[PDB]
């Protein structure tokens, strides 16, 4: 019984290296109060830029290594 | 890909001492003959001698062969070395 | 006081043998490059992957070589 | 991926958007090859792209050499 | 936005000459309405030539800093 | 034919028509050496051909080294 | 520094036969050895470990120590049996 | 390995740091001049080390092989 | 065999040493030939050393 | 924090051209305001040329010592 | 008992290297008394910039 | 005789006249260094000669190495 | 190819005693050995053969086979003489 | 020139037993060796010593001398032991 | 001490002052990196140094290998 | 001693005009062939006399 | 009194009769008038010829030392 | 030596002399080229001597062992 258990479990664990959990999903989110794109205001004296949300967020997250959590103003599976 | 295996190969009971020799000798001479042949035809095939993933296999096969024959030789020599000392003495 | 024995994963390695990711990715990157040999974004990638594959393959060969010399030297020590 | 891929990706992560900016500026210029203000921008962006790729390649090469010189000594 | 050292050395000239990039266009579209007025011609001459020198000096400076960098990067190997 | 031939032929098939395109465009240019359309067309083709040949040769070179370094350890 | 243990007390010799002390010594050596061989093999496959100059400088020491340990044991055992041959055969 | 009973890493971090500064602005001549030096010294250090570790291995092996 | 293929690639090359298409083909052929010859010689030597060692063992 | 020898060789140049590293950026910040002043052009040509030579000689010099050192270390075998 | 405790402890430790907990969080902070961006002013013959 | 001499001579017979085509085209040019048809003729001959010699030398080198590596295993 | 000949018929003899069986086995080995040694010596000094990879690949084998064969004959002869010496001493 | 010392009349009116002569030799050698190994390692660690030609040219000589000394002690010891074996061994 | 240090020293008593001169010339040049008179002198001194250090190290290597051979033939 | 003579002839012709590429090309070949010949001869001489020594050691 | 690698060096030194001095002479003349194209054209030839002379000499002595060391290794 | 006790010049002298001359001017090609061949001939001589001394001693050791 011991031998069988140890072998079986080791093989189960190795074969599950071929399975994948991390299916991506796509969210489509309409902005209700502002333009999505970035804007440029050519002041007669100076050109000035206001970035879009996409640009700002990408620049913020770029190169992160750790997870996200707590945006503010079975256990093994989770 | 063409492969065969012979399954019902060996008897596990206690058996006369004369035949354990014949069966060990024959099984070993067969294994070494086929091993050597596969080594040489791995070198002669141009698709195998030039692939770095294949060469790494041939290296292991060659080394395993070398060790196996070294050990069968050593133990057989010490086997007859025991008898000759017990008898001479 | 003596260091701990450790504990042995006897089964795992010999049947962990299987097709490496690394060769697969090297051949895939080569097949992407050969479609457009002048794209810098693809050249930069292939330089890195091919380099890593070179190092890995050498390190492995030299290791197999070292481990088998020890065994040949033992047997030659007793005969 | 090993350690070389990581070294390589440090440059690509350090320059936020240049791969995009350079392409966009190229497309704006190609529409109107003779506006000095479109032309001067592109000069700078392309210049920086050049240096970025050069440095990225030479660094990877150096690390490769240091590793192969160590691995020669295993035996 | 992301901006290298050369982009900075470039923008120094833009933010240096506050308004010339506009003034050359406004002087041009005044003159184009009335090519024979000496007071419009005499102004336009000076504005256009200032814009000329501006673009040339900017382009040569960026070229020189590029070549100092390429010279250093050639020695990493 | 070995593995190195395969690696070379991957480039030969990766570029479909480049060799004949180069041979052609050269003969069009040589028929009227002073036409800017033909000149512009030719520069790019010849540049592409140059990079193609270089990448091909450097890759075969690297693989040869990895193989000879393994074969050395049979002894 | 990740996980470590040590054995603090060794059993009294007054209760253990002469051949138990041998079995117990042998087993411990054979296991520490199989575990070192395995560790080295695993270091050679993690692509992070096999391509970082910092980690390679460690692997080179680990393999040099393994080699010296096994050469030492294999030499002293041969001297040990050679003494018995000298006394009995002679 | 210790002789039983006998009485009696910064350069890595420094190179990592210089790399991170350089990666942010590859066109700065001062960051380039600094990185060139850090990388050259690190390279020499690693080579001298690994050669010495081999020389000691080979002396221990020659000793054993002399009595073996 | 490989011996003839290499000999002929050489004969075609020496007719026009400046043709890239011929050069690329020759590099590949000569490379494979070099590897083949080395692998063969090393394997032969290994087998003979084993054979000799057995005799030295019983001698 | 540990200074090697190459670091010292480099710093010899930095502590040699004590102020040139500032003067170049200050003369640039003068010129970018009024690109047409001959006095400012004449000044910046000089300071820029000096800064070029300085960075170039520094990098070549560090490379030569790196090449001597490697050639000695290869003989430790 | 001792042999079970030591083994299970060492393995739990080796496994926990896979767990990661230093997860990042994002906070939006509005400014009530100043402008967010950099500003530039012209002086007598040079610019001044405030980051 | 020897085999490397046969390999080396195979090039000499492959290019029939080149060794003295160069010397002749040089003697012609040296008479009127400013004639463009002569300059253009000389450029290609001298290039061809350069490549010929390089290939000839490198091949003899490779064959030497293969032989030395085999002779090393007689022991 | 050019200037080549082969002996079709070997001369023959009776074999009637252990004496003649021994002289025959001796003479058979001596000549094969001399022929092999001469052949190798020539192959080392014809310059078309010393410098061609295909011919060197052959000479390697010829040398090996010579070594193995003479070592076998030496060993088995010494074993036979040692068995006689052992029995008569006993 | 720094801290020189020499013993005088070492054997003039006292003589050591061989039992002690061996022991003093062993100790005086083993400590010098261990200090030389530490000196080398330290000269490799210090960033200012591995990057200056003047200091590298000094370290090459230290490694050469250490390697030659340990090889000579090992060879002489093995050869001297051999003679006692040939004396005692029946 | 030792003979290999004697060989090493036979160079350093050969080049009387170079070890100083090089650093002194470097300090001068660093004071005014753009004087061709200074540059020209530094090029010479630096070259003479590079050569001295290479010749020294290769000679010490050779005498080390002669002694390591003899101490093996003691056996 | 033919291949010994050829190399000394080639060397004289070369030493006469060290920059002539036809002479350089010839000498490269002659020297390489001589280099292989010497090694092959020495190695086989060694093998042939190690076999004799092993025979004597077998009965000794 | 000398070996055979000195006979091999001396075959070059007596082969190129005079070049060793001709170089120094050419330099003595050019140093006096660097801006003269006839002197410059002469010196380029002499200096190149000397560079090749020295390289061919040193590589040949290296090869003969590699043959000898390999024969001596077999004296064992 | 200046000494004979009653009852040409060798490579050992020539090397020491050529090294001594070279070390005065390490960058002269005539002297370098004169020194390469003396250091090579000294290396070959000093190997061949020791290898043959070793052969004669192994012969005498084998004789003594054979008559043990
Ligand atoms: C009588 C005893 C003398 C020989 C003792 C044999 C002991 C060797 C057994 C061994 O360990 O190798 C197993 C070895 C490996 O078998 P495997 O590990 O089971 O695959 O088997 C053999 O090859 C047996 C070889 C026997 C050859 C000796 C013949 C005996 C003398 C001639 C008869 C007259
Ligand atoms: C009757 C037996 C008489 C002697 C027995 C002892 C055998 C060991 C003799 C080894 C010779 C030493 C040669 C060293 C050469 C050298 O120059 O190195 C000096 C070297 C440095 O010389 P220095 O200039 O003085 O510093 O010092 C050493 O390393 C000495 C090595 C000491 C190792 C000796 C180990 C003793 C193990 C044997 C003990 C067993 C006792 C049983 C008696 C026999 C059985 C009945």
Coordinates of N, CA and C in Angstrom, one line a residue, chain N residues 12-49:
Chain N
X12 N 74.1 21.0 18.6 CA 75.5 21.0 19.1 C 75.7 20.2 20.4
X13 N 74.7 20.3 21.3 CA 74.8 19.5 22.5 C 73.4 19.0 22.9
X14 N 72.5 18.9 22.0 CA 71.2 18.2 22.2 C 70.8 17.6 20.9
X15 N 70.2 16.5 21.0 CA 69.6 15.8 19.8 C 68.2 15.3 20.1
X16 N 67.3 15.5 19.2 CA 66.0 15.1 19.2 C 65.8 13.6 18.9
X17 N 64.9 12.9 19.5 CA 64.4 11.6 19.0 C 63.8 11.8 17.6
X18 N 63.9 10.8 16.8 CA 63.2 10.8 15.5 C 61.7 11.0 15.7
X19 N 61.1 10.4 16.8 CA 59.7 10.5 17.2 C 59.3 12.0 17.2
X20 N 60.2 12.9 17.7 CA 59.9 14.3 17.8 C 60.3 15.0 16.5
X21 N 61.4 14.6 15.8 CA 61.8 15.2 14.6 C 60.7 15.2 13.6
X22 N 60.0 14.1 13.4 CA 58.9 14.0 12.5 C 57.8 15.0 12.9
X23 N 57.5 15.1 14.2 CA 56.4 15.8 14.7 C 56.6 17.3 14.5
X24 N 57.8 17.8 14.8 CA 58.1 19.2 14.6 C 58.0 19.5 13.1
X25 N 58.6 18.6 12.2 CA 58.5 18.9 10.8 C 57.1 19.1 10.3
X26 N 56.2 18.1 10.7 CA 54.8 18.1 10.3 C 54.2 19.4 10.7
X27 N 54.4 19.8 12.0 CA 53.7 21.0 12.4 C 54.1 22.3 11.7
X28 N 55.4 22.5 11.6 CA 56.0 23.6 11.0 C 55.5 23.7 9.5
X29 N 55.3 22.6 8.8 CA 54.9 22.7 7.5 C 53.4 22.9 7.4
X30 N 52.5 22.2 8.1 CA 51.1 22.4 8.0 C 50.6 23.8 8.3
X31 N 51.2 24.5 9.3 CA 50.7 25.8 9.5 C 51.2 26.8 8.4
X32 N 52.4 26.7 8.0 CA 52.8 27.6 6.9 C 51.9 27.4 5.7
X33 N 51.6 26.2 5.3 CA 50.7 26.0 4.2 C 49.3 26.6 4.4
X34 N 48.7 26.4 5.6 CA 47.3 27.0 5.8 C 47.4 28.5 5.7
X35 N 48.4 29.1 6.2 CA 48.5 30.6 6.1 C 48.7 31.0 4.7
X36 N 49.5 30.3 3.9 CA 49.6 30.7 2.5 C 48.3 30.6 1.7
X37 N 47.5 29.6 1.9 CA 46.2 29.5 1.3 C 45.3 30.7 1.7
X38 N 45.3 31.0 2.9 CA 44.5 32.2 3.3 C 45.0 33.5 2.6
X39 N 46.3 33.7 2.6 CA 46.8 34.9 1.9 C 46.4 35.0 0.5
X40 N 46.5 33.9 -0.3 CA 46.1 33.9 -1.7 C 44.6 34.2 -1.8
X41 N 43.7 33.5 -1.1 CA 42.3 33.8 -1.1 C 42.0 35.3 -0.8
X42 N 42.6 35.9 0.2 CA 42.4 37.3 0.5 C 42.9 38.2 -0.6
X43 N 44.0 37.9 -1.2 CA 44.5 38.7 -2.3 C 43.6 38.6 -3.5
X44 N 42.7 37.6 -3.6 CA 41.7 37.5 -4.7 C 40.5 38.2 -4.4
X45 N 40.0 38.2 -3.1 CA 38.8 38.9 -2.8 C 38.9 40.4 -2.9
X46 N 39.9 41.0 -2.4 CA 40.0 42.5 -2.4 C 39.9 43.1 -3.7
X47 N 38.8 43.9 -4.0 CA 38.7 44.6 -5.3 C 39.9 45.4 -5.8
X48 N 40.7 45.9 -4.9 CA 41.8 46.7 -5.3 C 43.0 45.9 -5.7
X49 N 43.1 44.7 -5.3 CA 44.2 43.8 -5.6 C 44.0 43.0 -6.9

